[PDB]
Amino acid sequence: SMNPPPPETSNPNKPKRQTNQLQYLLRVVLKTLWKHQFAWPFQQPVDAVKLNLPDYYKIIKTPMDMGTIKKRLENNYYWNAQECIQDFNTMFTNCYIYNKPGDDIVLMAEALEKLFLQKINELPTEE
Ligand SMILES: Cc1noc(C)c1-c1cc(O)cc([C@@H](O)c2cccnc2)c1
What we know:
It comes from Homo sapiens (Human). There is one protein chain. The protein is 50% helix and 0% strand. The protein has helices spanning 20-34, 56-59, 66-74, 81-98, 104-120. It is built from five helices and no strands. The chain has a single domain (19-123), classed as Bromodomain-like (Histone Acetyltransferase, Chain A), CATH 1.20.920.10.
């Protein structure tokens, strides 16, 4: 079995812009979620081969993870904060679609999501 290519993190054709909100997403939001005790399953793309989940990429067609998000932030991939917020949302929603409501991995995602939303409440206004 095989994993798909990861989500795009480099594209010289895509216009880029640094914004105070993007800087906050890296320096506050991502950094805080990354250090959380439940972050580890989310720090890299799901390796469906290693985890013996052959159905994963049949069910999840818009994959996303914090490793990818970290690279997109550090390598200035984004034009705006909404693109980055959408990536986090995709990551959470994927987890909830693929797994069962009770599952440990779901409780971990929910903890991270609660935290994420608290941090998004302090998103600075655009300079
Ligand atoms: C994220 C995500 N979304 O769907 C799946 C499935 C994962 C996932 C990713 C991993 O890297 C490891 C594990 C699994 O071994 C685990 C981790 C923690 C608790 N309970 C189970 C699950």
